């Protein structure tokens, strides 16, 4: 049960207990999982009285390539347990690549627990700094409308979908958020670009009680608002006649929205008046719900360029930087949210995992060995290595972060990070160029509609005979299928290489499937990633999914706003 003072006190006690709870986090992870086969090869059994020392002297650091076959083993019909343990209820993907290729990680109910608490805690310190009305609401551009099922019959998933469609999500978040404007089915609408418009419209619906505007990211926010600049007159029309735009085709959201609609002409006079009154839409956000106390989102790292466009939108409204973690392990809360984005820092919550740091202090890089978290050095930058319930045990995520200070005894983290970048050579390609060129070729049938392609992805399905390619697309508007069908053909026609030519012309690799997905999917991916625990080197999204990639994958299937197999061929 969420309250302000007790949780912050316990959080104070806890951050001050940083060593014990960290050490205990280690013990707990391993108590739960003394059985890991990874660990068998390492010599573990638990207990003893040199545990921490034994773990750190006996267990080698690991990369995405090496963790790939094992969680892959878990996901594909070998429903089996491995690097963590339990076949997990879901699996993630990780930005940057595993040699150009897919990265799999386990999701457990622990990951849901950390989730509520960090936000339990987060909202508490922020509402400590930005107190909300206990009867108002929030404009949250959040989505987890999609849920794919892996080929072994096992769920593999995003942080969003798995949290939002989690059984404990609704009851758990009931007390620590202002109630969502959107009915869950539209949030979970098989069409989230249309649902996004419905979301624009939903948060817009209860503005006067609305206490914050939220996206995980500033870029998410700005995406919403440039779109706002595009569609406000249409929204006026839709909401006005009590009849929704012909833009909207999926019946359950249409069903829910008709439940929301009756004809109301006066207010249009209002919105039109205010909206045309602005100077280049500056300060749009306080214009919509003028008593929102904040704009909330991740403001650091590769999102720093999106803080300003958003600031333009935010006007003089304060920007509060969001905390930092993902399914791969939670890292740190901002408990002083009143701090500006440029100075925003996030302090580590210690039972979320057992975390260690490799110093770059020598040159670049530096053959120094990992030292503890309160053993880390102020002002210096270290790489995060993660041990938690997410499949990570002493795992190199590949990201560099800086110590600005300590809140009591737990250290304060800063990100000036962006790409976790080096790469290696692939096989979800059909080169980066070939795939990218491909979307380019196909997307211009859409360009004819005054729309540009925002983002794209892909996938190898080998449950099917023959197996098939799935191309995923993020565009700026609803359209017809015919052009999208057309597009899929071009995705196929853009793969200029002779090889692909052999199979699909013969047909021993099946017709590519274009499953068009809805707005914000790749936004779901960026938002989950930069927030992901390590250091904002977290944004080069892998472009085609081998069976071993997941975070994009849960998000794969359910918002097929349409999905097709080439009627050519």
């Amino acid at each position: 049960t969420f309250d302000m003072n007790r949780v912050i006190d316990e959080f104070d006690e806890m951050t001050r207990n940083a060593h014990q709870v960290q050490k205990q986090t280690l013990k707990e992870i391993l108590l739960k999982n003394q059985s890991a086969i990874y660990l068998q090869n390492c010599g573990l059994n638990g207990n003893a009285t040199d545990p921490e020392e034994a773990f750190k002297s006996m267990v080698p650091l690991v990369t995405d390539v090496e963790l790939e076959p094992y969680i892959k083993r878990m996901v594909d019909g070998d429903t089996s347990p491995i690097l963590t343990g339990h076949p997990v209820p879901a699996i993630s993907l990780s930005s940057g690549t595993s040699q150009g290729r897919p990265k799999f990680i386990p999701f457990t109910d622990e990951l849901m627990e950390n989730t509520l608490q960090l936000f339990r805690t987060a909202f508490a310190f922020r509402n400590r700094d930005f107190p909300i009305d206990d009867n108002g609401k929030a404009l949250q551009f959040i989505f987890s409308s999609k849920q794919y099922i892996s080929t072994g019959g096992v769920p593999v998933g995003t942080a969003t979908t798995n949290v939002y469609r989690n059984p404990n999500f609704k009851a758990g978040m009931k007390s620590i958020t202002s109630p969502s404007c959107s009915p869950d089915e539209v949030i979970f609408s098989p069409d989230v670009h249309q649902a996004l418009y419905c979301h624009l419209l939903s948060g817009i619906l209860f503005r006067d009680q609305v206490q914050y505007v939220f996206a995980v990211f500033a870029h998410g926010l700005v995406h919403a608002f440039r779109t706002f600049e595009q569609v406000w007159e249409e929204i006026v029309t839709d909401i006005k006649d009590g009849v929704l735009s012909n833009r909207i085709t999926v019946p359950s959201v249409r069903t829910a929205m008709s439940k929301l609609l009756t004809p109301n002409p006066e207010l249009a006079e209002t919105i039109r008046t205010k909206c045309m009154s602005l100077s280049n839409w500056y300060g749009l956000i306080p214009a919509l719900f003028p008593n929102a106390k904040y704009v909330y989102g991740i403001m650091t790292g590769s999102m720093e360029p999106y803080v300003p466009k958003l600031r333009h939108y935010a006007g003089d409204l304060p920007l509060v930087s969001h905390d930092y973690g993902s399914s791969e392990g939670w890292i740190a809360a901002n408990v002083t949210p009143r701090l500006s984005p440029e100075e925003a820092t996030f302090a580590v919550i210690p039972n979320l995992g057992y975390f260690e740091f490799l110093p770059v202090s020598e040159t670049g890089e530096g053959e120094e060995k990992p030292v503890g978290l309160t053993q880390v050095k102020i002002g210096e930058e270290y790489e995060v290595v993660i041990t938690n319930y997410a499949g990570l045990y002493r795992y190199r995520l590949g990201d560099v972060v800086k110590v600005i200070g300590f809140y009591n005894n737990t250290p304060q983290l800063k990100f000036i990070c962006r790409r976790n970048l080096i790469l290696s050579i692939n096989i979800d390609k059909n080169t980066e160029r070939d795939l990218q060129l491909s979307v380019e070729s196909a997307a211009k049938r859409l360009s004819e509609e005054k729309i540009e392609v925002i983002d794209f992805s892909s996938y190898i399905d080998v449950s099917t005979d023959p197996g098939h390619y799935a191309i995923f697309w993020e565009i700026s508007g609803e359209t017809n299928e015919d052009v999208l069908q057309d597009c899929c053909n071009c995705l196929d026609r853009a793969f200029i290489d002779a090889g692909y030519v052999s199979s699909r012309k013969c047909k021993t690799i099946g017709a590519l499937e274009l499953r068009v997905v809805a707005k914000g999917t790749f936004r779901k991916i960026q938002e989950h990633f930069l927030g992901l625990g390590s250091s904002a080197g977290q944004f080069k999204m892998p472009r085609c999914v081998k069976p071993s990639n997941a975070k994009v994958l849960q998000i794969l299937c359910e918002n097929v706003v349409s999905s097709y197999f080439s009627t050519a061929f």
Binding site: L437, E440, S441, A442, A443, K444, R445, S447, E448, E449, K450, N480, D482, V483, Q485, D486, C487, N489, C490, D492, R493, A494, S566, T567, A568, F569
Partner: protein, 214 residues
């Protein structure tokens, strides 16, 4: 500086713009109000009064396919649309003539007329896109091993494909896919990717045309 007399939905004006931009000319476009055909246009073709019209050396160059061969011959050093043999040239010209007859009239029928006229036009264009699909066979383009003469000739019809799909209430793609398929392939050329206006608008122009004449 080449002056082009053009019309936003002219598939033919588009033949001109695509041709020129395919080559390497920087040129100016002037939009026509065919209710008020220009002093320079009425001097370019005082009887047809039709576009596209490219003006070079103060010499009016008229008719779309005429204008694109003009494109070839006015800058003969970089991007040829024909191949080297005379027979290949006659094949490409052959097929450009193909683009211009039963193909153009049939689309004219599918978005311009209805009923007894419509289905005639509908089976005509499916037939056309089928002989088309047959001769495309495999080639990335049409008139050479690269972006060709008639590539320019028939690519420009692929923004009206939306128009045809809707009033026809068809889908010209499950009957002959490699065609539209080749089209969004040809859209990657900066020659057509900046010369051709939006198809919802093109759709809407045929909608205006239809609403006028029912």
């Amino acid at each position: 500086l080449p002056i082009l007399l053009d019309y936003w939905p002219s598939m033919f004006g588009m033949r001109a713009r695509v041709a020129l931009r395919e080559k390497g000319v920087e040129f100016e476009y002037r939009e026509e109000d065919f209710s008020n055909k220009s002093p320079l246009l009425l001097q370019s073709n005082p009887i047809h009064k039709k576009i596209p019209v490219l003006v070079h050396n103060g010499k009016p160059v008229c008719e779309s396919l005429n204008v694109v061969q003009y494109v070839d011959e006015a800058w003969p050093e970089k991007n040829p649309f024909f191949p080297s043999d005379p027979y290949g040239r006659a094949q490409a010209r052959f097929w450009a003539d193909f683009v211009d007859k039963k193909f153009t009239d049939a689309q004219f029928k599918v978005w311009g007329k209805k009923g007894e006229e419509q289905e005639a036009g509908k089976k005509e264009f499916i037939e056309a896109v089928k002989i088309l699909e047959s001769e495309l066979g495999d080639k990335p383009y049409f008139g050479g091993d690269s972006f060709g003469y008639v590539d320019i000739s028939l690519i420009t019809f692929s923004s009206w494909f939306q128009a045809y799909e809707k009033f026809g209430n068809f889908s010209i793609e499950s009957e002959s896919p490699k065609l539209i398929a080749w089209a969004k392939r040809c859209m990657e050329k900066e020659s057509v990717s900046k010369s051709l206006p939006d198809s919802e608008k093109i759709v809407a122009y045929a909608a205006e045309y239809r609403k006028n004449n029912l």
